[PDB]
């Protein structure tokens, strides 16, 4: 019985069927919102071929991964359980159906359908979340290179199921860096305040004042016309006022060129950090995986640290509390029984029954898993909270 | 109109360097993107009152407001607790009038009605309200020798 | 303002109108653009009475809606608690029936099958009172604990 119990998968709570599924969409970096809207409309029309769904709600320009014109998300709400009490009408079945149908239809971008966990705070399968920090401000390229080297050291020569070791950010995208020539701006009457004024007024919005709109106050904003902020050749053609009101093409002042920049920046405990995710391959304790990760990080120079985030935090602190609590409970039970029987001998006779219930519960769970998996399903039962509560109840009754 | 680098270095780092010493702080994070918006998240160890934590965080933030850019001060900086007890979702569909008109109608006629119900703790509306928008044509300004500051 | 008059107004170089602030997000429900609102329950508030009240108030307000508009409530988290309560009551009644049948089969009298029925609900009520004293609430986990006990 103890051997059977020691070989059970662990988790926190089982995934539920709340009645809705979640969808996320991404497009190539640097895409507009019209393409995102077209892809969302295609997804919405595709969501109508699944009778298990009732309402589809789509939100454009926003996602939990990040915010941008190439990101979108939606929520599909299913009919009540009674109307969809069949084999392939579960929530996970619908999610798989939707992902598979998206794969072969979406021509621009990719979408993924998932079923959210019961409680976001306590969710199984989160894996290992890591945050590399640099303690001496080496920069962004150096930290990205170190992160890539860590992923390679962790994936090939590692034990983390190399299919899951991956970064958790957003890849860079081209930009329009501008280099102003202060020497050249000084060779003429071109100051440096007018440059900023023109640059920030041309293609950016401005908040001026307020006005009473039929009872309540509202903002007044000034922006350039839409026809003047659509092309890269709409900036360099911004002649700057001179000392005598003359115009400088701004080509003789600044040089405009494409480069590659970061679209997002993160910081953890005061240090620049980049997120990462992983998961132990199989038959490996999380403790050994964490120790290997820590040693690997130490392998890097002095100035790059590691720090767990999310659910990894409560595992870093040793889980040597349940054993102590159970030992204390057993001691208290023995003392109470010894007081009741007036002997130090019978209480152990009573305590010899715990293994029976433990073995019964473990064998039942294992047999049910085997039977389910024997018909094509996946093992759904593990050593979660409900297992512990039921085991405690059976222990009490047998005692 | 602020890139991730500018937003971070000019607002988020300044705000974050001052949130040290708040009683019961566990760890903090910072996130910025090109959308022109960012946030700072402080997580507190259990057994700490959330109202006291929020008030102390607001008081700490009150001592650095004079060092941020002018635009950030004009728009303002918020402070709220991440806790929430979701109850339900309400949707208004018209198909005949634009989304801004529906947003205005909801904010001016419906939202105040549900806030007075017994048991409602807070209502949030998703979407931007109205404003007076002016669309300037730079060709005209160049023809008249004017500027945006004018 | 010119020396000779004929001033330059704000409509010679611009176009003034009424609009939004951001233009970033865009919501839709089944293909028709909508506007969504989220309702949060206050601490120490019944989650079923509040949903009923919200629905009734919306039904009342629907009369003055502009032509074309309508309202819907796609999601509501107050049904899970109701389902859990119904399950708890169903299991309580079924357990009472099973106990009655077993006791009558083994003891073979109707005077024995009343004591357990009288004494179980009192214990459940005592548990309810204690959990109320400690400042807890009624949720799915509490109902599952009652079913187990």
């Amino acid at each position: 019985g103890v051997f059977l119990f020691m070989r059970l998968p662990t988790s926190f709570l089982p995934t539920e069927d709340q009645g809705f599924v979640m969808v996320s969409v991404q497009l190539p970096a640097g895409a507009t919102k019209e393409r995102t809207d077209a892809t969302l409309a295609q997804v919405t029309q595709l969501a109508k071929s699944i009778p298990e769904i009732e309402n589809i709600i789509t939100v454009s320009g926003f996602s939990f991964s990040g915010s941008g014109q190439n990101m979108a998300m939606g929520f599909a709400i299913l009919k009540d359980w009674n109307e969809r009490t069949a084999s392939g009408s579960d929530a996970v079945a619908v999610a798989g159906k939707l992902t598979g149908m998206m794969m072969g239809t979406l021509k621009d971008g990719f979408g993924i359908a998932v079923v959210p966990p019961p409680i976001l705070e306590l969710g199984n399968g989160s894996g290992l979340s890591i945050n590399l920090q640099d303690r001496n401000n080496t920069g962004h390229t150096a930290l990205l290179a170190k992160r890539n080297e860590l992923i390679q050291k962790m994936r090939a020569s590692g034990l983390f199921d190399p299919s899951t070791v991956r970064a958790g950010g957003l890849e860079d995208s081209p930009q329009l860096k501008i280099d102003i020539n202060r020497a050249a701006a000084a060779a003429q009457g071109v100051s440096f305040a007018d440059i900023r004024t023109a640059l920030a007024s041309a293609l950016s919005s401005s908040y001026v004042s307020d006005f009473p709109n039929q009872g309540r106050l509202q903002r007044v904003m000034v922006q350039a016309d839409g026809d003047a902020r659509m092309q890269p050749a709409d900036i360099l053609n911004l002649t700057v006022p001179n000392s005598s009101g003359i115009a400088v093409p701004l080509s003789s002042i600044a040089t405009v060129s494409w480069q590659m920049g970061t679209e997002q920046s993160v910081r953890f405990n005061g240090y620049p950090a980049m997120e990462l995710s992983g998961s132990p391959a199989t038959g490996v304790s999380t403790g050994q995986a964490m120790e290997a990760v820590q040693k690997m990080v130490d392998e890097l120079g002095s100035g790059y640290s590691l720090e767990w985030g999310g659910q990894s935090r409560e595992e870093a602190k040793g889980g040597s509390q349940t054993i102590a609590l159970y030992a204390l409970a057993a001691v208290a039970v023995f003392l109470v029984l010894a007081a009741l029987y007036e002997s130090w001998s019978i209480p152990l006779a009573v305590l010899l029954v715990m293994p029976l219930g433990l073995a019964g519960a473990a064998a039942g769970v294992t047999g049910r898993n085997l039977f389910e998996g024997l018909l094509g399903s996946v093992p759904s039962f593990a050593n979660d909270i409900y297992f512990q509560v039921g085991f405690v109840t059976v222990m009490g009754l047998s005692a | 109109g602020a890139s991730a680098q500018v937003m971070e270095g000019s607002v988020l780092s300044v705000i974050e360097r001052n949130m040290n010493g708040v009683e019961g702080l566990d760890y903090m994070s910072t996130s910025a993107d090109s959308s022109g918006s960012g946030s700072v998240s402080l997580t507190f160890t259990p057994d700490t009152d959330e109202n006291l934590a929020q008030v102390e965080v607001q008081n700490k933030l009150s001592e650095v407001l004079s060092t941020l850019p002018a635009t950030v001060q004009q728009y303002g900086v918020t402070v709220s607790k991440a806790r929430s007890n979701f109850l339900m979702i309400v949707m208004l569909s018209s198909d005949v009038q634009s989304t801004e008109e529906m947003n205005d109608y909801a904010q001016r006629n419906v939202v105040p009605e549900l806030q007075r119900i017994e048991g409602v703790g807070q209502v949030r509306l998703f979407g931007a309200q109205r404003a007076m928008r002016i669309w300037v044509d730079p060709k005209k300004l160049q023809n008249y020798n004017l500027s945006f500051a004018d | 303002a010119n020396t000779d008059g004929s001033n330059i107004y704000l409509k010679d170089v611009a176009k003034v109108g009424l609009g939004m602030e951001d233009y970033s997000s865009s919501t839709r429900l089944n293909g028709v653009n909508t506007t969504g609102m989220a309702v949060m329950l206050s601490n120490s508030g019944n989650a079923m009475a509040t949903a009923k009240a919200v629905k009734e108030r919306l039904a009342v307000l629907e009369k003055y809606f502009p032509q074309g508009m309508s309202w819907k409530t796609p999601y509501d988290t107050s049904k899970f608690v109701e389902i859990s309560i119904e399950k708890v009551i169903h299991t309580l009644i079924e357990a009472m029936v099973l106990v009655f049948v077993v006791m009558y089969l083994f003891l073979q009298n109707i005077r024995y099958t009343l004591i357990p029925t009288i004494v179980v609900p009192i214990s459940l009520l005592g548990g309810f009172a204690f959990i109320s004293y400690m400042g807890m609430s009624i949720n799915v986990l509490t109902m599952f604990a009652m079913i187990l006990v």
């Binding site: 926003f62 | 918006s37 979702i89 949707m91 | 796609p74």
Partner: peptide, 10 residues
């Protein structure tokens, strides 16, 4: 931000 989603569904 947190466009249509609550904690959490739409």
């Amino acid at each position: 931000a947190t466009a249509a989603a609550x904690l959490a569904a739409t």
